[PDB]
Amino acid sequence: VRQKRREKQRKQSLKRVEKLALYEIRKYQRSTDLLISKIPFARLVKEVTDEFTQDLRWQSMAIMALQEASEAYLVGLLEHTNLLALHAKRITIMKKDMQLARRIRG
Amino acid sequence: QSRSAKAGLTFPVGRVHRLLRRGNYAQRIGSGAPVYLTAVLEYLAAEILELAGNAARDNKKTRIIPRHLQLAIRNDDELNKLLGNVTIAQGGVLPNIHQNLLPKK
Amino acid sequence: ARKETYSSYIYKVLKQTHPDTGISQKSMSILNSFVNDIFERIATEASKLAAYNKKSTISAREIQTAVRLILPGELAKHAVSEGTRAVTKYSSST
Amino acid sequence: DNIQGITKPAIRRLARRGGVKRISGLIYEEVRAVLKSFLESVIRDSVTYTEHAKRKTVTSLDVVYALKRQGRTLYGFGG
């Protein structure tokens, strides 16, 4: 159980060392990794594939590429709706703002 | 009977087989693929022709104008999601008026 | 000299569906461009799908998957119905 | 339910990645609905690819080919 001892040592190291909303915009714009929790998204795409299926398997890198592409499409639609939101003199976005960009793209 | 009419269809099979034979799409070709192309394109043609006849009946005419083609394609949902990004010469956009510009209704 | 078109077949299937309707030549050229465009779409997608399936031939399976790809699902199941009808009425080679 | 697995602070962090100051409470359900719609629209092609191939593994090659077919192509997982 040397891997378990190394994991407990790394967890202890993270617990000891590693452990006005304007900061989060510039904070999460320089982040590179994913931002959606992994295994609920895997359960969700398993439920989506149950509509169009048979015990269809799943490689892990395929679900990783799906999570990356879905996060990219969502931040693309959100970055495009922010401009239409501020264009209508709304700092706070609304569901009407994510209707025209969902309409005029297709 | 020839291969263009052995299946009791309308579109020619030798035409699309000659187009794929010199179009360099594969090494070989299965026998069911040109008649399958025949069936798919004749069903698409028959569906858009039925919608074109319905569009010509909607405007009480007999012949087909590009307005009848626009009423055939852009009114149906699947033809909109299939032929949305294609422009049509002298077609005509759909008649739709927003309500806030009308001061009554 | 000639240019390959399908105006005769379009007029034949149109008079077969409803003989009391006509069609001009501009809409005929539009529909000829349309059928050449969707033939190009299905043929290039089938070539892509055959190159992706490690198989350098074109059977009806790749065409079935390709019309399940780009056509909508109601038109996809109607297309596989028409395709199975075409193969079953063509296989009687007597 | 698995559609609500992407919770409220997840979409909040996504919006902070996309640069929003204040967000409303009507955003999250439409975000989840358009996410389910995009996932269905890519997964139908990605499983017809693996159903043609006499396979049951939805391979990364199949999802990058389905992404290249629908415009939004990814890099690194084939192609």
Partner: peptide, 22 residues
């Protein structure tokens, strides 16, 4: 010869709801 009709009930009004399932 004769072609049967299908479901033509909508222009697929989307972007605030979901689509139909076959």
């Amino acid at each position: 010869l004769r072609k049967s009709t299908r479901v033509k009930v909508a222009p697929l009004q989307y972007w605030r709801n979901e689509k139909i399932v076959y």
